[PDB]
Each structure stands twice: as structure tokens, then as C-alpha cells.
Design a protein around this ligand. Sequence first.
Ligand SMILES: CCCCCCCCCCCCCCCCCC(=O)OC[C@H](COP(=O)([O-])OCC(O)COP(=O)([O-])OC[C@@H](COC(=O)CCCCCCCCCCCCCCCCC)OC(=O)CCCCCCCCCCCCCCCCC)OC(=O)CCCCCCCCCCCCCCCCC
Ligand SMILES: CCCCCCCCCCCCCCCCCC(=O)OC[C@H](COP(=O)([O-])OCC[N+](C)(C)C)OC(=O)CCCCCCCCCCCCCCCCC
Ligand SMILES: C[C@H](CCC(=O)O)[C@H]1CC[C@H]2[C@@H]3[C@H](O)C[C@@H]4C[C@H](O)CC[C@]4(C)[C@H]3C[C@H](O)[C@]12C
Ligand SMILES: *C(=O)CCCCCCCCCCCCC
Lengths: 122, 171, 12, 62, 81, 165, 127, 71, 166, 128, 88
Amino acid sequence: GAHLARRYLGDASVEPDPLRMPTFPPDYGFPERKEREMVATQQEMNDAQLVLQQRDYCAHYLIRFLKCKRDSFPNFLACKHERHDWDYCEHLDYVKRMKEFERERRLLQRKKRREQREADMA
Amino acid sequence: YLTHQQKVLRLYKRALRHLESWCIHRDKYRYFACLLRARFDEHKNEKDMVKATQLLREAEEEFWHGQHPQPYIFPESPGGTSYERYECYKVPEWCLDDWHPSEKAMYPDYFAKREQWKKLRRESWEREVKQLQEETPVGGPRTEALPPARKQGDLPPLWWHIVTRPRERPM
Amino acid sequence: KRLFIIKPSGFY
Amino acid sequence: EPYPDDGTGYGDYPKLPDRSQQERDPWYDWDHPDLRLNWGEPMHWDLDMYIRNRVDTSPTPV
Amino acid sequence: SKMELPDYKQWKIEGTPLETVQEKLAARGLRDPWGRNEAWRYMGGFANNVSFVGALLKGFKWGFAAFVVAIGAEYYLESQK
Amino acid sequence: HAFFKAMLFMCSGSIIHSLNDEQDIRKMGGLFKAMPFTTTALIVGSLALTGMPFLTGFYSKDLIIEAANTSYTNAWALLMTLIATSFTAIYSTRIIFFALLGQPRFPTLVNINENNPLLINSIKRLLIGSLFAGYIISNNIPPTTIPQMTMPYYLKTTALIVTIL
Amino acid sequence: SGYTPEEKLRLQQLRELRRRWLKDQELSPREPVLPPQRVSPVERFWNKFLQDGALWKNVIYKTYRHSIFAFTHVLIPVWIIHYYLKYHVTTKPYTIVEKKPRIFPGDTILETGEVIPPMKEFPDQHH
Amino acid sequence: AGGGAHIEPRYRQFPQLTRSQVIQAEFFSATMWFWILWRFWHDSDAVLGHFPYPDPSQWTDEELGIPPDDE
Amino acid sequence: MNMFSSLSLVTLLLLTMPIMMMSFNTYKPSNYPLYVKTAISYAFITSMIPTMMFIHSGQELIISNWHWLTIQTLKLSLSFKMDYFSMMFIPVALFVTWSIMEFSMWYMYSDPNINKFFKYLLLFLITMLILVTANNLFQLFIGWEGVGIMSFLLIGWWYGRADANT
Amino acid sequence: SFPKYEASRLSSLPTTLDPAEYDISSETRKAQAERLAIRSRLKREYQLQYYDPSRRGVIEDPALVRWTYARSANIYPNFRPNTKTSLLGALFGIGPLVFWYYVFKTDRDRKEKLIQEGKLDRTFNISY
Amino acid sequence: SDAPPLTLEGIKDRVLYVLKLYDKIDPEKLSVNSHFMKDLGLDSLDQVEIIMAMEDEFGFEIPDIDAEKLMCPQEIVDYIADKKDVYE
Ligand SMILES: CCCCCCCCCCCCCCCCCC(=O)OC[C@H](COP(=O)([O-])OCC(O)COP(=O)([O-])OC[C@@H](COC(=O)CCCCCCCCCCCCCCCCC)OC(=O)CCCCCCCCCCCCCCCCC)OC(=O)CCCCCCCCCCCCCCCCC
Ligand SMILES: CCCCCCCCCCCCCCCCCC(=O)OC[C@H](COP(=O)([O-])OCC[N+](C)(C)C)OC(=O)CCCCCCCCCCCCCCCCC
Ligand SMILES: C[C@H](CCC(=O)O)[C@H]1CC[C@H]2[C@@H]3[C@H](O)C[C@@H]4C[C@H](O)CC[C@]4(C)[C@H]3C[C@H](O)[C@]12C
Ligand SMILES: *C(=O)CCCCCCCCCCCCC
């Protein structure tokens, strides 16, 4: 990616650190934020035997897709819509992570930007 | 050893074989095979032996620098894929003397005729020894070449293990 | 052409 | 040419060239085609290390 | 059996890349005696062999013909619904 | 990999047997027309190994290359993997060019016969597998990970660009 | 650069002996003289039956041999394996351990007729 | 090796090709290309991309919660 | 489970039958390559039944049928793991091994020891199925080392060749 | 132009690049044919027995009986306890034994200290 | 190995067939007993290529010790027939 060219071959203080992110508290902006809404419950995922890395906020669609696949057998070409639903939810989840990287990316600009004024001036 | 004539011919054969490996395509090989022949022609009839050696000795250095790292080798030649592939099927003839009579009963004609060869080998041996005991110098043989048969009805001395040797595709 | 195959004795 | 008399036990066994049996001529009619040896020929002290299944010393292109 | 070999007079380097090699050798005073030995490799069924792009496209003509029918049929059946 | 790789050796064996135990591609050539069925299987196998889309080898190799790119991974190990994908096309093309195309380089008397029903059926079944096996397996096995289906255009198609080049 | 007259003569004499030896390696029509074999009556029925390579006849042979194989190599073994697993291997604790079957929201359990509540409403995604 | 058809080897000539040999090879080559085109027609997002990839720059500082510099 | 277990073991047992028949000589020669090829074919169809039962509902199980040895607090029993990486590899290996055995009937037709060749190809397949289905390391070590030995005996098939032994 | 070939104990000098091959003199010629006399003299003694039709057994090879004797029974009587053999036998014979002793005594001393202190994980270790 | 066995006539036909395609040999005077050096005026450098063409014809190498000893197409047939166990 282009970010790798910046954190290594250039200034590294303004680039996010993937292992340490996030740094700023979640409420720096956003006068009010909403907690993520987990549709599935622990017993539902537990009884569906989802792999622990599959028990994310998209799990509710995954549960429905697996149920359709079992019922649609032997038709493996079926449950095409259910798969896309789960894929799209994982696509939205990935974008939120991309937004989180940008939020940390820009908030680190603030420190490098609201610190020359308080250093150059005095 | 190898006389200067033999060493030049060997280098020419090696040079063309390795060259054939680089070229691959026949038409391209037929081009550089002629050019390489010309280089062996500009000095075809050199007179000074010392100069001839210096030409041969320099060709080898150019051959070593230019040889293909992975030259083509015929399948059954030393270092080839099929080399010694059938040496496990090559059984000697003396193993047939240990056969049970029941097995020999399956090939009555083959073993009847095999008995004739054994008689032929057994009758001609004492003559073969003499044929070599008289043509050999006083000290001993100075070369590995054997002489042919001189009298009608005699067999070439030391013929059994070159005549009865197993076939190249025994099975 | 159905040659004779020389093999060691297999009877024993 | 025997080995140097250094007291390691070589005695008078000949010091033959340290060449593998892969360097021998493969077209000569050896008495032992696989070993590339002749009956009566003196054997290298390390012959069993130089058989064609083991250490090779043939010239390399590089 | 007794394989009957073809007449040996048909093997000519004419009209083959072997001739082009003989032209370039004629510009240096050298000749190629063995050209006719390699001639059979450029004549008969071994002449005008396919190219690499033509090898990877083997069966494309019939494959494409079957493909156009399939999608055309798919449109028709889906026309009903 | 089991389907199309086993096919390549069997196609290699057909060529070797025809040319009287000649395993060197320098003494092959002009077999595209002489061995049409062995040629078809070799081409199909060389397209699954290289990653031709939708054949058997596409449903595993390209997911790997996509997941290797979008991972917190060693950078140099990623570059070597991509270069190795370029080399896969080069040596697969090497077999096709030096064994199928061009003019013959094998001896004058050769029996190029590949009509034995055992040879056709064995290669034929793997030929079917090296076309549809990846599609069938991928659509039947249950998911066990969160596949990465969102990424920059130049990371999704890196396998194709590398292979085509 | 060629054979000396002595060498040529020896090669010819070796060649004439070698060819005759190779000739003697040919088998006569009688050979091999197999001893009598007790031919099974069943195989006799098929020797005559397969006298003419009829397409329909060999199919019956094809079905016959496959049917026998499916009885001596699939049916008999599975009977033994099932008996072994049914009454010897599954009668001991923790021998065959089956991963519990997956339960999804809205499934009915056969053992007790229980019903799993459906999941909460999915708000909306559309796309 | 053993079975099939007995083809006479030809000396310095093109080998003899049977009929079913050439039909089957052409059919499977065709079957390959039909499969690739049919799969490409229906599933082209498996090789070019399924979902759009956002451009982080175009995201507004309001939705990322980046409070203004002064405050 | 009654069918999943029985048909998952019949596959392994089916492949060992040709080995057993070639020990007590309860078979006829010159059909052995065909006999072994047919065993793989039936082993492939039977192995597809447990695979389908997995594809249907994701059914897996572990079979610990024979108690072999108990070293104090370590109990070693012959255990077979029929799971994701056993219901998908066995069908693939048998399908590929089916073709290679058929191709071998033609490629190795003139080999005098074609019967031993098909016994070694079969023994390797058994040691690979032992390795793939192993539920404990010791049993995994049996097929892990067995495949190496059968590789050794097949690489040096033409044992008269020095380069084959090396 | 053409870099010279540099040999090694595992890469012998090619016969086509060895000066002694192209420097053919009178003494070398006599030596080469003088060797071939021995090769033929031995080759004849072997052949008179190999081709013998009444022979059944093993042709004893005096060269093979000299090689095994030279490698087993002739070693000790031709050994002298000098500086070369004493240092080689000291560092190859005793050296490894002392080296491994300290590798294991140190390893077990360190392990025993942890076990006594109770800071070595042996939670499930009940097989020794 | 499924290939047709060689015949004495076949070896002679193919040995001469290759020489007939050698420009420096006149097909009219070419015979089984035609010595290369003393009946066709070919230098040894040309005889090496003759042998190299024979080994490319039957697909097996002829060692240089014996290649430089064959000076006649009849001898080549004997050498090839002896190294392929051809007896009729
Ligand atoms: C109490 C009532 C019951 C009575 C009890 C009485 C008990 C008394 C003892 C009776 C024992 C009977 C012995 C046989 C009698 C003679 C039969 C006969 O006529 O011979 C004809 C037989 C065939 O005739 P031929 O072709 O003319 O032979 C001449 C050639 O020279 C032949 O040379 P070749 O190159 O063709 O082959 C040589 C070698 C084979 O060549 C090789 O490949 C050597 C390398 C093979 C080993 C590589 C794999 C290593 C891994 C072992 C895997 C097994 C453990 C797996 C455990 C977990 C899964 C179960 O021979 C073999 O060993 C064949 C078997 C290979 C092992 C088979 C393993 C898989 C079998 C299936 C196991 C599952 C069974 C479940 C059944 C259901 C439960 C009951 O000739 C011979 O084989 C002569 C040698 C006989 C030796 C027998 C000993 C076999 C030992 C097996 C190999 C060692 C494996 C090491 C692991 C040991 C684990 C136990
Ligand atoms: C963990 C270490 C265990 C110690 C043992 C392993 C170390 C090597 C010492 C054992 C090898 C010597 C055995 C005697 C030789 C017997 C066989 C023989 O004669 O060879 C002839 C053969 C020659 O075969 P060839 O194919 O090379 O050439 C023969 C000639 N042709 C090809 C023309 C036919 O050589 C071998 O097969 C042996 C090669 C292996 C030896 C080298 C091992 C290298 C190990 C990897 C090093 C990098 C470390 C990687 C990480 C792994 C280590 C943790
Ligand atoms: C059915 C199968 C091949 C048939 C085919 O594909 O044409 C044939 C080929 C050789 C046969 C086997 C061998 O003849 C050895 C056994 C002979 C007896 O008929 C018992 C079953 C036996 C084990 C046979 C089962 C089956 O009929 C076999 C395996
Ligand atoms: C970045 O995501 C890491 C990608 C590492 C694999 C190389 C892919 C090519 C990247 C080119 C940089 C493009 C920047 C616009």
C-alpha cells in the first residue's frame, strides 16, 4: 500500500501504528457514539459451533447461511443470496476498520499540527 | 594414450555435441555446425607439431568455458536417464544349471540345445589355452587384444562370456 | 518373438 | 608412492590418486563394471568412500 | 513388417528454413552437407505447426460457439420469468 | 494441486513412452499435432498450475495470493512469493514450447502412438478433475475463516498481472 | 584408423557365434510345456461363452465379475465392520465420539421436541 | 504398450492418427473454453473485484469525528 | 453414525484386501494390476458416502476401536480421526490413485515385476491413509515413516542402476 | 579471456586442461605402455580362470585381500605414539566426552535449581 | 519396450539412407563395402560427422574408441546389430 511508504520512508509520527491503534479515546470527537449492535447471542453462536474468529459482529448472517446450506443439501449451488449477505456485512465491517485507521491517521496530524504553534511561538 | 589425431577428433565431437545442446533447433545447429567446422579447417593441415598442440590446448580452454552446464546425454549412455536401467533383469547363463528338473521339463528343446553349447565350450577350451600359450611373448601379454581363430574348426579364444552375455532387454 | 527369459530358479 | 610415515598405520599401502570411481572411463570393459575396477588392480585406501554411490570428485563446469 | 522407407529423393531443403541457413552460409564460402538429412523435420505433416498463442486457443472456436448458444438459451428461458 | 499435477506427469509419461524413453525436451517438438490428446491435457494442466481463472488451480492459488497481500506479513516473503508466481508461467510455457510447438527434434523412427484406452481414460478423469474439481470443492466445503473480499484493485488482480507478464 | 585384419576376423567369428546363440534363445512352438492344470468348471463355462467377442456377451461378464467383487470386498467386509462396531467397539466408553450436531436458531430437537427461538430481527442491509 | 490399436510406425513421416483420438482431444479443449467463458460471464467479480474499495481521502472529517483544530 | 463409521473403515480395510490375498496366495496372477485398480475404485465410491455426510451436516467423529498399550498414565489405542482433513483428502487421493494405477497398467506393461509394483503402490496408499487419519502422534509416526520406506523402495525400483540407489 | 581452472579435492582438474597430457615425451610414452603391460598381464590371469568351464566358485582377488588387511589388521603394527597421533586421539577421543559432560551437567544443574525453587512448569508432567 | 525390433536389412537400409543424404557422398558409387577414406575421399573430420549422424539415427551413442574404428557402412551395421542383439 501507499501508507507503508510513509511510515518507513518518511515521517513516522503522523502515521498510525497498527499494533498500538487506537491511541485517542473513542469520544475525542463524536459528542455521542453508539455501541455496536450484536444481533446474535452467545448461546446461539455457541450452539452453532462457529470458529472463534467467526464470532464477530457479522455472525448473525453467517448463522443463517450455514442453516440454509444444511437444508439446501444436496443443492450446493443454492444459498447464494445468504452467502452474499454475510460477505457484504464483512465488507462493511472492513470499511469501519479502514475508517478507524483514517481517524487515527488524521488525529495524529493534529498533534503534529497543534504542536508547532505551541513550540514555534514559545 | 591418445595420439594428437585422436585428441582433435574427440574435441570436435564434444564441441559439436555441446553446441547441439545450446542450439536445440536443427536449422540453427546446422548453421553453427558449419562455422565450427570451418574453425577446424583453417588449421586442418598444420605442419609444426608444437604449434598444433598450442592450437589444440587453446581450443580445450575455449571448450571448457563454453561447454553447456547441462549437456544432452543419450538415455542409455553413462549419466543418461535410462543408463543401467535393465541391469537388474540381466541374469547370467550359469543360473540355469541350478534349475530344478521340473522347471527344465517346461523347456525341453531349449535345454537340449543349451547342452550342445556346453559341450562345444567344453571341447574347445583346451585348444583355446594353447592358442594363447604360444602366441604370448615370453614375459607376458603387452596388450589386451585377443587373437582370432587360426585353424578351421577352432573357436576364437575366450569367447564364452562375450557370446553368451545377456541381451540388452532381457525381459 | 517369445525368447527364453533367463531367470534364477524360482522352484525353491 | 606410500603414505607419509606419520605413525597413523598406513604402512606400505600405496597412495593412489584421490579420485572417485565416477571419473574412470565408463566405456572400458572393466572386470567390475559397477565399481569400475579390474581384478588385481590395487584398490584405493578409501575405495568404499569413492564408489559411485558416495563421494564424487568429477570435474565441475564451475 | 519389413518397413518400406520413403524415396530418398524427396528430401530437399528447398522452401524450408534450412534453405535460409544455406543462404547465409553461402555468404561466407561455407556449405552445409547435412541439410537434406534434417529436411523431413520441415516437410509433410510437420510443416506449418501452430504457435504458442494458437496452442492455448485450441478448441476456442467450438468452445465459443457452445458458449454463445448457452447464454442465448439462458436469456430465452429467463424470458418466461 | 493433486489433480492437475498428477496429470502433468502422466502427460509427461505419454511423451516419454512415445519417444522411446527420451526425457529431454531438447529432443522433443512438433508433438502438438502428433499427440492431440496428450497435448490437450498438457495445456489444461499448464493453465491450472499457472492459475487460469475458474480452472481447478484458480480456486486455491488466487485466494492464497490475495490473502498473502492483505496480511500483516513479512514484506520480503511477500515479494518472493509474487516473483515465484511469475516463474510458474515461465517454466510452464517452457514445457509447451519445447515439447509441443516448433519442429520435430526426435529420431527419425518413432512410434508416436497414444491410442491405448488405458492412457486416455486415466488422463481423461484427471482432465475432468483439473477443470471442475476446484469449483465443486470450493462450493461444498463449509466456511471456517473470514475471507478477505475487499481490497485495492492492484492487490486483487496481482496474481493475474504477474502470471500474464 | 580402422580395424586391423586380425581384429576384423575375430569380430566376424564372434559375430557368427553370437548370432547362433541368440537364435537358440527362441522358444519352439511346444514350449513352455506346462503340466496339466485342474480347470475349474466355472472357468470352462466362460471359455466357450467368450468364444466370439460379442459386445452383449462381455457385458454380462463385466457385470458378473463386478457383482462378485462388490460381494467379497464391500458387502462381506462391511458386515464384519458393522458387527465389530455395533456390538464390540460401541459398547465401550468413549470409543466412537461424535461431535455434537450443530444447532441453529429455529431448529427442532428430535430427542425432546424442543424448539430453538429464532434470532433477533435483522435491522436492515438491503445491499 | 499392450492393447488399444496397432499403428504402423512411419519413417521420417507424420504418425498415423486415429479418429476418436482427435475428436476427444478437441471436445475437451472446447469444454475447457466453454467453462472459462461461462464462469467468466456469470462470476466476473471473482477475478476483478466484488465490492468497491473506498478512498479514505474522500471521507469527511465530520463522519470520522475529527474535531476542529481550534477546539 | 452407524453408517458413517462403518463406511469410513471399509475404505481402509478394502485397500488392504489385495495385500492379504497376495500373502496366502488366495488369488490368480496376471489380473493383479486390474484387481488392485478395482479396489481403489470401490474404495473411492465408499469414501464418498462419509464425505457427503460431512458436506450435508458437518458430521465428524473419532474411532478408537482397539486398545493397544497402556504405559502407566498414557493409553495408546488405534484411533482414526474422520474430520475435515480426512473426508476431503481420502476421496481426492483415491481418485488420483485410481488414474495413476490405470495409467500404470499401460506404462509398466512390459515390466516383469508389474505385480510387485502394484503391491508397493498400494502399500504406500495405505501408509498415507494411516498418516492422514491418525488421531495420535505414534500412529501418525507409523504412516509418516511408512511412506518414506515405500518411497525408498519405489525410487530405487530399477535397483541395478547405481543412480537409482543413490 | 578464459579464466584458468582451479581444482579442489572434490573437483579434479579435467584431463583436457592438464599440461601433463599435452607434454608427451619419450619417458612418458614408455611409462604409459609399461603400465598397460601390467594391466594386460593381470587381465590375462583373470580371464584364464573366468572363462574356464570347469571352474565353480570365487576367483580369489589378492588385491581385495590386501585392502581389507590393510584397513583392519595392518593398522596397529604401523602406529607410533608420536605428537601427531597423540594430539589427534586426545582431542577427538577425550575432547567430545568432556564437552558433552559440561553441556549436560550445566543443563541438569540449572534445571534442578529451578525445580527446587518451584519455578519450573511441571503441571501435567507425570511421565518420566 | 513396445518398439518394433530392428532387422539386419532395416539397419543396412537406414545406414545407407543417411549416407545417401550426405552431399559429400555420391549415391551412385556408395555401397555397403565402400571404405570412407579410400573409396569416397572423406577426411576423418567428415567421418566423425558420419558416426554422429548414425547415433542420431538409432538414438544411442557410439564411444569415440570404436567410432574412429568404423570406416565402412557394413561395419556400422555390424556394430549396431551387435549392440542391439539383432541376429536376423
Ligand atoms: C490363532 C488363530 C490364527 C493363527 C495365528 C497364527 C499366527 C502365526 C503367524 C502367522 C503369520 C503369517 C505370515 C505370512 C505367512 C507366509 C505367507 C506367504 O505365503 O508369503 C507369500 C508372500 C508373497 O509371495 P511372493 O510375492 O512370491 O514373495 C516373494 C518376494 O520376495 C516378496 O518380496 P516383496 O518385495 O514383494 O514383499 C516383501 C514384504 C513387503 O514388501 C515391502 O513393502 C516391505 C516394506 C513393507 C512395510 C512398509 C510399511 C510399514 C508400516 C507398517 C504398516 C502396518 C501397521 C499399521 C498399523 C495401523 C493401521 C492398522 O512382504 C510383506 O511384508 C507384505 C506385507 C507388507 C505389510 C502389510 C501392512 C499393511 C497390511 C494391512 C494392515 C491392516 C490389517 C487389518 C486387517 C483387519 C484386522 C484383522 O511372500 C512373502 O511375503 C515372503 C515374506 C513373508 C514375511 C511375512 C511377514 C510380513 C510382515 C509385514 C512386513 C513388516 C511390516 C513391519 C510392521 C509390522 C507391523 C505388524
Ligand atoms: C540434524 C543433523 C543430523 C546429522 C546428520 C545430517 C548431517 C549430514 C551428515 C550426514 C550425511 C553424510 C552421510 C554419509 C554419506 C552417505 C550418502 C552418500 O554417500 O552421499 C552420496 C549422495 C550423492 O548423490 P548426488 O545426487 O548428490 O550425486 C551423485 C552423482 N549423480 C547425481 C551423478 C548420480 O549424496 C547424498 O545423497 C547425501 C546428501 C545429504 C548430505 C548433506 C545434508 C545437508 C543437510 C542440510 C544442510 C542445511 C541445514 C538445513 C536444516 C536441516 C538441519 C537441521
Ligand atoms: C472385477 C475385476 C475387474 C473387472 C473389470 O473391470 O473388467 C476383476 C478383475 C480380477 C478379479 C479378481 C481376481 O480374479 C482374484 C479373485 C478371484 C475370485 O473370483 C474371487 C474374487 C477375486 C478377487 C476377483 C474379483 C473380481 O472379479 C476381479 C477383481
Ligand atoms: C500495500 O498494501 C502492500 C502491498 C505489497 C504487495 C505489492 C503490491 C504492489 C503495491 C504497489 C504500491 C501501489 C501504491 C499506489
